Amino acid sequence: RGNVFLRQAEIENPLEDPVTGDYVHKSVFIIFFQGDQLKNRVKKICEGF
Amino acid sequence: TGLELLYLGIFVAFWACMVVVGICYTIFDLGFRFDVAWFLTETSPFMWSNLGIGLAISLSVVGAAWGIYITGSSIIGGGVKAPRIKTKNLVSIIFCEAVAIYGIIMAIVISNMAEPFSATEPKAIGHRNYHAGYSMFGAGLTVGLSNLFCGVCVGIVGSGAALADAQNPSLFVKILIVEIFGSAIGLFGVIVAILQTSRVKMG
Amino acid sequence: INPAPYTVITFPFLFAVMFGDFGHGILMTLFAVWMVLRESRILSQKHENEMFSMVFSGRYIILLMGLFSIYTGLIYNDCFSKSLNIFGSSWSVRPMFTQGNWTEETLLGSSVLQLNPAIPGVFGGPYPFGIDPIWNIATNKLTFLNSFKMKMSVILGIIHMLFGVSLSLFNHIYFKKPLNIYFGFIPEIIFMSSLFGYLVILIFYKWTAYDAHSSRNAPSLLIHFINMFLFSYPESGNAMLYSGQKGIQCFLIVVAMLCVPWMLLFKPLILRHQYLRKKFDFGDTMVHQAIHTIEYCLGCISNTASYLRLWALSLAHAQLSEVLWTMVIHIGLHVRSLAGGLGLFFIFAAFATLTVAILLIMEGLSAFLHALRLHWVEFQNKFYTGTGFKFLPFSFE
Amino acid sequence: YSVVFNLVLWIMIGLALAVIITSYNIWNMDPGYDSIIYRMT
Amino acid sequence: LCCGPKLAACGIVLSAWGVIMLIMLGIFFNVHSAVLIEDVPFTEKDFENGPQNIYNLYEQVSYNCFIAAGLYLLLGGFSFCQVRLN
Amino acid sequence: NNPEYSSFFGVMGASSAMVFSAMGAAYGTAKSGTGIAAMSVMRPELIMKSIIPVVMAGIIAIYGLVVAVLIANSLTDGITLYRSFLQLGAGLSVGLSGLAAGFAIGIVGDAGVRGTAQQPRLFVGMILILIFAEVLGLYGLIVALILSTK
Amino acid sequence: NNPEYSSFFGVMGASSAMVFSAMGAAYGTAKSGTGIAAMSVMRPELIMKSIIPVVMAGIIAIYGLVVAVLIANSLTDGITLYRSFLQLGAGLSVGLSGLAAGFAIGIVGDAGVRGTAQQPRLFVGMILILIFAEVLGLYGLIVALILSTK
Amino acid sequence: NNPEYSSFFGVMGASSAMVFSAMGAAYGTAKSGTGIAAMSVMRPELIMKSIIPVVMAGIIAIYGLVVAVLIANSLTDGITLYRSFLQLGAGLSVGLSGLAAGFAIGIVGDAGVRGTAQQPRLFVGMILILIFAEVLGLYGLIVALILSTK
Amino acid sequence: NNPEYSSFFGVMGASSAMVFSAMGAAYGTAKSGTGIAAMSVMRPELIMKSIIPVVMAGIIAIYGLVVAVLIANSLTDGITLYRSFLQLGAGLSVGLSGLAAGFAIGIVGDAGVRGTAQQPRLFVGMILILIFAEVLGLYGLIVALILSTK
Amino acid sequence: AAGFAIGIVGDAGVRGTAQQPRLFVGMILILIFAEVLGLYGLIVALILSTK
Amino acid sequence: GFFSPGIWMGLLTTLFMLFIFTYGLHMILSLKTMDRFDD
Amino acid sequence: SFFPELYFNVDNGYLEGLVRGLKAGVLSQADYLNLVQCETLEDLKLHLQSTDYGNFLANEASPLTVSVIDDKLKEKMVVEFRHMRNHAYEPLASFLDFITYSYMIDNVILLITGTLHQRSIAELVPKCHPLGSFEQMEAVNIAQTPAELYNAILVDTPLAAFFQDCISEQDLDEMNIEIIRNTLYKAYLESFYKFCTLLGGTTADAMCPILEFEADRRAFIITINSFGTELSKEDRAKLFPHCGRLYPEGLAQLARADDYEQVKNVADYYPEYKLLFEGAGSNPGDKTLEDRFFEHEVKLNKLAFLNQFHFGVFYAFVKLKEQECRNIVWIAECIAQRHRAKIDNYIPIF
């Protein structure tokens, strides 16, 4: 609900897939929170991602 | 649909204008300015002839294309799991082009009898040229429309037969009966277009 | 009846009728020579171009196709859309034309066309080989070319079909099928003959009969054929082509009518009689016989009409070649004393690329496939059952 | 006058049809239905 | 090396075709003296006096064919040289 | 003398007579063929029977001929306006009657093929309905004759 | 002296009496046909009792035919244009009334034939609605005759 | 004798003769392009073969030009109405035939391009049907030519 | 003797060439643009490698503008109606051909820009497909140059 | 045309201002041009009444 | 002049062309594409 | 001169040809007759190699078990469906998305019941159908109140279009999940019926009876199975669909039922369900009612295929294909256990 903040960073070289071997792209993110219940909610979301 | 609404609006406006104009003119005792004789005597016979000539090939080609696509799409799609149907089901395409062949032959036949004249007023041209122009226009129109509807029906049944043949080999050889019965109406159209202009002596 | 021995030649012939040009034929035969002579190295070589593999499959196809293309380029007197005046013209002689009140007109010649007539006394005459070159420059060439090409196409198509049915007669006689010869081949060949061999013979009669002075009221064959179909005899409007046409024409109509019922009732009934003698769905046999007879009778007109593809594509090819000549290299010739060859080098390079791209490989493909279709349907279905198995040997890879 | 009537009539019909079509299309317009629109409450 | 053989073979056949066709067209102009059937193109808006101007102009036109042939032959030689770069 | 535009009306009538008949016959034949093709997968033994609808549609095409020929034979250079009106009326009547009958046969056949595919006892019933559609077309023919040879 | 072109209108009247009415009767069978496609697949025994809408459509066609024949028969050369307009009005009247009757008959027959599959008593209701749905054509025919004979 | 309205019809014929063919070829190329985009991802190796439908559509353009200059090589100030309408008829014929051929080429090209991606053997068959599509243009050209001389 | 209204028709050519021309250059320059956005998110490297369709659309706009400016430069007040017809025909041909070319380049670009992101090879194919549409535009120009000189 | 533009941009700005107040400024700037689409027109019409 | 002698012919021809151009435009406008992409 | 006859093929001919080609790949009755004669799973594998279901098990499955066959068959199904969807145009894409929303609802309900069984978190992933998967499928675990579920689902899954307003609560439990299921299902069915009747033509004719029967079957099931619940009769009235022919019945007779005989009396006035119930003896020695429901569904789906311009033959195809998958896996399971009690209880499709 917009009470938290986030920032993103990008990588160029593709990272290999250990199981199949296909190349896929990724990105890095950093979130600043204000509570632990939100940490658990975004932990569930990040388990989804 | 916006396009259908546009067409309906144009059509309704046109017919409302026609109705209102007709009623006020008839009530206004102005029937002497509606002289259809001038309308159908100023027009040159060659315009009627050439419109007929154009249509007699144009509409046939339109029907041929319609049937070509309608059967070809199904023929190509349905053969992925049965390549055997590529060559067995080529009769429909052959008929879809035979329609255009008939159209071209009719265009050649009617294209004759185009000797100019020198008269420039209705009293000098005479009845014969008027008859020639009207008859040629009518023949072109009828052959074109007949071959159009013929080609559409041929294409539809060709698609049906081609699609059904991929299930069992012993189907197509008997489902082609409707396919052959399709072409008879186009043949009739050609015959009538022949007969309508069998007594024109323009020149 | 194996159709390869005849097809191997009648296929490039029909192609060459569809593709009758000299230079393009020479290019095709040169490609054929290249591909034939280098066969050993290319065969022992890996190539990524599958198109080239299927091109290479048809070696002698392309060779014979190019040979007959060269021939038919020579016979039309077509060579890159221009005739080759080899051993003389016989049409235009202006010094002789001055006899027939032909002088001073060319002052108005700057804005008129001044038709040339036939036979002011020494004109006409047959060129011993091909089309007279003057026709290539005549502005009304299209009329005579259309007439000649349409007639040649129709005549070629009728003999192809009679060939088909006569070949079928061999197919049936070997298999010991007296019924098929007696109530099969005979009515169909008689129908084909009576309906179109008459047209062939009439075309040749008109060719060898009417001279130039009879240009007034020259009879028209197409209207006579419409009256052949519609049985209409107006008292006037078209003079008889030859005396006594009425009786022969009427008998032709009556035999054409009498052809159809012979193929419908007699042979299913004889099959029924044989089955009765044995002691067979009769209605299904009647349905099959009606299907066969109607198919043949309508395919008659449909195939004779579809043989016009020869004329159509030949005329289109001639028009396309002339169009290329008209607005690609025509600009290349001009008055510039120095820049002629320089610009013409670029222009002819472009001409070569464009005539390779369009008429060489493509119109050749269209004619190739059209002739293949004419072989598959109009020719093959009259003697070729088109059913059975194909060998599957036990050989490994 | 019999020519000016036709000329003005056809020009007027064309211009009227054009404005009608364009305004009609600009009315039935898809804003996108993004997180601003679809979302409510 | 430069102008690899892959296109140089096509270039060589093109140059041979150009040389042959241009030479033959020029010879057809000169030998037949530009018969109107085989030679429509020209540049003269006034010829009513006699044919000598027409013949001279058509010879002038046909002259350029051999220059074109020479350029095509030089192109073919250049392509052949590039083929030898192996 | 007569006006010079008399033959135009008869010409248009003769054209329309075959145009409309052809459109109706085409629609009926197309729908009957589609029905037969759809049905053929499940009941291969009924293929002959379901051809009865399509041939029915074909008959309407023939009706068109019986009008369009008859006008073209009776047309000449200087006919009067009365006969031209008569021929136009006959042609339009038969053409549109044939069109409507064609639509009727098409719909009825498309349904009846399915009915006989799923239920044999249906078949003969639907045959009756098809005849009724044909009746309408024939009525058109009658009117045209009374408006043609008169 | 009555003009000659006046006859044209009269001829067109006959055309309507066989065109418009016919189209109505087309619907009057066609929809009913697809209704049967849903009825007899589970309840075939009632097929013989389900022909009534088709007979009503045939009756509409009969009305159209009788009025068209009557209009065409009375036609002559020397007509006052008032007679021609009277005939045109009668023909248009009967044609459009028959169109309405055919539409109503078709829809009612379709609804009733689909509905009878779960009510054995729907027969009387279908008949008693159908009488009203068909009386329209009779009224149009009555007035068409009273106009034409006058 | 001939009014100033004459060359109107010939000029419009010349314009339309090419405009319609251009539109048809454009639609064919568009449909084939989207079909190629769909086909590409799984089977790249066929790309240089699947150009065959596209070039085919392009043919139509050239055909229009064969007439679009030709009629333009005969127009002059002193031309009668007869020749003008002859030019008009030729132009309409070629233009509409080109339009129809373009539609057909586009559709069958898309279908075959999609088909070959999962069955290479289909390739041959595709080209065969496409031949017919090209012929649709060819006939439309031919008549136009013989309408420019007579 | 020349009618006053004659110049009108030529003036409309001065509009028409441009009027449809820009429309084609609004069909493509927009649509292909969306394509180059759809994968600037993921593979921004190919942003400038498939912008060709937009440049071509600009080129068809130039094709229209050339004929427009020549049309305007060949203007007068006592123009004979024949030259007026020629001028309007040239304008119409160029305008409509340009509209079609713009359509084709636009849709093909919107497809190919998306196709290139799944495999690189498709790029080569599109350098042909797009150019084929461009050929149509060039063709229009040629006919205009015959209608402004003969 | 100007009325239409104001209507659509007003819908956009109205539903966008519910999220964050900083969309108050930018949208109104758009609105200025969306009204100028009308203003221009008035000017020329006055000239057509001046003569 | 009711309308004129000639513009009747002109209008007939131009309307006839207009119908065909509308045929062309209906199918040129209502072409369709694909969504997303095959893997 | 109507929609399906003259421009159906331009955007659908190839895909319809492919679907009708793949229809023949469905196993036939003789295939069942010979497949029920296997001795071990390897024989089943081989007899599938001999037919169109061959060359999909080339893995190193030495310890072959029926779960592997189930997984591979489902994988084949999703592959063919994704193929059919990706090559489609836009109205057909709307149709196929409308189809897949059902499995998406199924996955949503599965994860909602999984949240109650907190002990399992990741294991739910292999249990969910990949056909009904979407971008935010696994996020459903986050919610603990139905308003939070609407917040999660409003985001980018169009499933919210069926319950954005239709759910009003703030106390998720294990009893209201059935209410969520029924509300979502009835909303989806109503939207699908409305869209199908908006499309018009033969598509409406083909898809109206099927959804009608689907709504009526849901009504019958919910009426029978609602016994012994905290819900009141008015709430049972609230959940009935209005797309069937039971629209007056939904409040008139079913909404006041008290026993099974009353439901039978409701069914008695419609032959289609009356024969279905009479044939469903529900005895230990006879098939249950669910079996007759499945058989009637199969029969109607098989009927649905026969239509040349069927814009929605994909519904029948996917339902039949799921049913073949179920038949095959069930027969394999019976064979693996070395018993022949219920081998001859397979519904005979094609």
Author numbering:
A (entry chain a): 192 to 240
B (entry chain b): 3 to 204, 206
C (entry chain a): 389 to 667, 712 to 829
D (entry chain p): 601 to 641
E (entry chain f): 5 to 90
F (entry chain o), G (entry chain n), H (entry chain g), I (entry chain h): 6 to 155
J (entry chain j): 105 to 155
K (entry chain c): 413 to 451
Which passages does the manuscript contain on this structure?
The synaptic vesicle V-ATPase is an ATP-dependent proton pump that establishes the proton gradient across the synaptic vesicle, which in turn drives the uptake of neurotransmitters. V-ATPases consist of an integral membrane V0 domain (also referred to as Vo) that functions as the proton pump and a cytosolic V1 domain (also referred to as V1) that catalyses ATP hydrolysis. The V1 domain comprises three pairs of subunits responsible for ATP binding and hydrolysis, and its activity is coupled to the rotation of a central stalk in the V0 domain, mediating the translocation of protons across the membrane. The V1 domain reversibly disassembles from the V0 domain in a luminal pH-dependent manner.
To further confirm the identity of the binding partner, we used synaptophysin-knockout (Syp−/−) mice, and purified the Syp−/− ISVs following the same protocol as for wild-type mice. As anticipated, essentially no SYP1 was detected in the Syp−/− ISVs as determined by western blot. Finally, the binding partner density was absent in the Syp−/− ISV SPA maps for both intact and V0-only V-ATPase assemblies, validating the identity of the binding partner density as synaptophysin. Synaptoporin shares function and primary sequence similarities with synaptophysin, and it is present at a slightly higher level in Syp−/− ISVs, potentially to compensate for the loss of synaptophysin function. However, it is improbable that it interacts quantitatively with the V-ATPase as there is no density for it in the Syp−/− ISV SPA maps. The absence of an interaction probably arises owing to primary sequence differences between synaptophysin and synaptoporin at and near the V-ATPase–synaptophysin interface, suggesting the specificity of this interaction. At the current resolution, we do not observe substantial differences in maps and models between the V-ATPases in wild-type and Syp−/− ISVs. SPA maps of Syp−/− ISVs validated the V-ATPase–synaptophysin interaction and demonstrated the specificity of this interaction for synaptophysin, but not for the paralogues synaptoporin and synaptogyrin. We observed both intact and V0-only V-ATPase assemblies, consistent with the notion that V-ATPases reversibly dissociate the V1 domain upon acidification of the synaptic vesicle. For Syp−/− ISVs, there is a 2.1-fold increase in the average copy number of intact V-ATPase assemblies and a 1.7-fold increase in the average copy number of V0-only assemblies.
